[PDB]
């Protein structure tokens, strides 16, 4: 309806995109350190068997 | 009366300067809205002030 400035909407879209990027970073941080805990059971982990 | 005349001259000068200042403010607002940094509401107020 042409009420608010365009730089305000630009800054809103940029914020949403940045938040998406940060969530991707967090998900990736989780995916790593899940490669170590692949085995379901604690007694079957490679370190314990050694 | 002779003094009222000079008073009027001075007031004319002052209001001319005020008009120039309002013109400059309006132009700045219009350019900012053209590039997207301001809302249409801001432009309407500068036009009213001019």
From Swiss-Prot, chain A:
It is found in: Cell inner membrane. Part of the tripartite efflux system EmrAB-TolC, which confers resistance to antibiotics such as CCCP, FCCP, 2,4-dinitrophenol and nalidixic acid. EmrA is a drug-binding protein that provides a physical link between EmrB and TolC. Homodimer and homotrimer. Part of the tripartite efflux system EmrAB-TolC, which is composed of an inner membrane transporter, EmrB, a periplasmic membrane fusion protein, EmrA, and an outer membrane component, TolC. The complex forms a large protein conduit and can translocate molecules across both the inner and outer membranes. Interacts with EmrB. EmrAB complex forms a dimer in vitro. Belongs to the membrane fusion protein (MFP) (TC 8.A.1) family. This is Multidrug export protein EmrA. It comes from Escherichia coli (strain K12). The gene is emrA. The chain holds residues 152 to 201 of 390 of the full protein.
Swiss-Prot record, chain B:
Homotrimer. Part of tripartite efflux systems, which are composed of an inner membrane transporter, a periplasmic membrane fusion protein, and an outer membrane component, TolC. The complexes form a large protein conduit and can translocate molecules across both the inner and outer membranes. TolC interacts with the membrane fusion proteins AcrA, EmrA and MacA. Forms a continuous, solvent-accessible conduit: a 'channel-tunnel' over 140 Angstroms long that spans both the outer membrane and periplasmic space. The periplasmic or proximal end of the tunnel is sealed by sets of coiled helices. This is Outer membrane protein TolC. Outer membrane channel, which is required for the function of several efflux systems such as AcrAB-TolC, AcrEF-TolC, EmrAB-TolC and MacAB-TolC. These systems are involved in export of antibiotics and other toxic compounds from the cell. TolC is also involved in import of colicin E1 into the cells. Belongs to the outer membrane factor (OMF) (TC 1.B.17) family. It is found in: Cell outer membrane. Disulfide bonds: none annotated. The gene is tolC. Changing residue 42 to A: Decreases inhibition by hexaamminecobalt(3+). Disruption phenotype: Cannot grow on efflux substrates novobiocin or fusidic acid. It comes from Escherichia coli (strain K12). Changing residue 38 to E: Partial channel opening. Increases sensitivity to vancomycin, by allowing its passive diffusion across the outer membrane.
């Amino acid at each position: 309806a042409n009420l608010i400035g365009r730089e305000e909407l630009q800054h809103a879209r940029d914020a949403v995109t940045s938040a998406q990027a940060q969530l991707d970073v967090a998900i990736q941080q989780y995916n790593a350190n899940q490669a170590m805990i692949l085995g379901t059971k604690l007694e079957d982990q490679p370190a314990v068997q050694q | 009366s002779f003094n009222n005349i000079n008073a009027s001259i001075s007031s004319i000068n002052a209001y001319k300067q005020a008009v120039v200042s309002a013109q400059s403010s309006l132009d700045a607002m219009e350019a900012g809205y053209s590039v997207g940094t301001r809302t249409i509401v801001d432009v309407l107020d500068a036009t009213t002030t001019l």
